């Protein structure tokens, strides 16, 4: 059972125009215009990257790039960590008598 | 429910009134739990010069002479600023790194 549902996930983009599979001319796309066009072909824009850094719109890097990314996954504990067993788990994690 | 009244900020309910408004040009943005931050850079700073010693007045006298109108264009400006062009025998090609750009209205009036 795969949880996700195709309708909820991101809709698959349409198939690329058959004009780009011809090696190799300049497909007349609507890139010259600054608005969607029904006729003509669809271009392939490059991945735009913002030059300056905006705190209100800043994207963080992935987990594969970090200053102190360690391989040994350490399990932290905070007030929200609701244990399952109870006092025995805390006694085992602390190594103390009750 | 009239169709002639201009849709403004005095028609819609609470949400519409709060979202809509007049063309007053916002200053800053809104973040956190209703905490509007004002950006001093976006605030319009009026550069007012000193009027001391200004011998001009907002009204002209009637004893002034009448002269024809001369629409100032690029040709007239080039003809007026032709001294160095003739002495050679001052132009920017790209103004991307310029503060007061011409074609892209980066300034205000």
């Amino acid at each position: 059972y795969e949880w996700g549902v195709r309708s909820t996930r991101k809709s698959e983009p349409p198939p690329l125009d058959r004009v780009y599979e011809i090696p190799g001319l300049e497909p007349i796309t609507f890139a010259g215009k600054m608005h969607f066009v029904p006729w003509l072909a669809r271009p392939i824009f490059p991945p735009w990257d913002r030059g300056y850094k905006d705190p209100r719109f800043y994207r963080s890097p992935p987990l594969h790039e970090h200053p102190l990314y360690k391989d040994q996954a350490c399990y932290i504990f905070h007030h929200r960590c609701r244990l399952l067993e109870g006092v025995k788990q805390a006694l085992w994690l602390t190594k103390t008598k009750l | 429910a009239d169709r002639m009244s201009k849709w403004t900020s005095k028609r819609g309910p609470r949400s519409f009134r709060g979202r809509k408004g007049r063309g007053a040009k916002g200053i800053g943005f809104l973040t956190s739990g209703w905490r509007f931050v004002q950006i001093k850079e976006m605030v319009p700073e009026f550069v007012v010069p000193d009027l001391t010693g200004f011998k001009l007045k907002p009204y002209v006298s009637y004893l002034a002479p009448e002269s024809e109108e001369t629409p100032l264009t690029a040709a007239q400006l080039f003809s007026e600023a032709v001294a160095p062009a003739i002495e050679k025998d001052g132009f920017e090609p790209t103004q991307e790194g310029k503060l007061f750009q011409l074609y892209p209205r980066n300034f205000l009036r």
Partner: protein
């Protein structure tokens, strides 16, 4: 025709996901099934039908332990969250499954039979002949689909080569592979069919609108059809 399915949750979460009722409406807005709508709000819990599924950096078998037995409003049979290893997963509860019990989850097809308890699960290749089972899968690694209601339980008939014929509760034979996993015993929540409704209040609370008022004239399909058992359908 705005109709977005609430089933939007890739990560298997344990918290009750907010269930947005439908009322018999499709993506367009027209009713295709009468008798659905107007009920009490519920919260669906992501059930882990796939019994066998090791966690990270794991492969071999692993034991389990029962914590509590709660009720599920989305079905007739109750549920019971079971924790195994460094994670938890909601699963269907079996009869006589009290809190704190130990559930064994293995997949090695032993040479001989294995005396399975009233909660553990083993491949059909290690189950004695004639044993009630439930939550049978269709294909290897597919997931439990057959025999999942309250009280339902199919008995094992016989094994032929690397296959096994399962007698579903509907007196229908189904040939399933021997490498497939399936629980044992009967589902919890016994004596459910005898649960008298009592009043239409509970029926409406469950989310079932009253039947239509049209006097449908009984045609030929209304007569009793003493049909025989259907042929055995295999999946090989």
């Amino acid at each position: 025709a705005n109709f977005v399915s609430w089933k939007s949750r890739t990560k298997y979460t344990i918290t009750p996901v907010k269930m947005r009722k439908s009322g018999g409406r499709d993506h367009t807005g027209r009713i295709r099934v009468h008798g659905i709508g107007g009920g009490h709000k519920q919260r669906y819990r992501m059930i882990d039908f796939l019994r066998f599924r090791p966690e990270e950096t794991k492969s071999g078998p692993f034991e389990e332990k029962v914590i509590q037995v709660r009720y599920d409003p989305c079905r007739s049979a109750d549920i019971a969250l079971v924790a195994g290893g460094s994670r938890k997963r909601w699963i269907i509860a079996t009869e006589n499954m009290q809190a704190g019990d130990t559930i064994l989850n293995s997949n090695h097809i032993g040479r001989m039979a294995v005396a399975a308890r009233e909660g553990d699960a083993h491949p059909l290749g290690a189950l004695p002949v004639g044993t009630l089972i439930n939550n049978v899968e269709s294909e290897p690694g597919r997931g439990a689909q057959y025999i999942r209601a309250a009280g339902t339980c199919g008995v094992l008939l016989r094994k032929v080569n690397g296959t096994a014929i399962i007698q579903l509760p509907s007196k229908r034979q189904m040939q399933v592979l021997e490498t497939c996993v399936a629980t044992v015993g009967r589902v919890s929540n016994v004596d459910h069919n005898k649960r008298v409704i009592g009043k239409a209040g509970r029926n409406r609370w469950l989310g079932k609108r009253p039947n239509s008022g049209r006097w449908h004239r009984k045609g030929g399909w209304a007569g009793r059809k003493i049909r025989p058992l259907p042929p055995m359908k295999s999946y090989v």
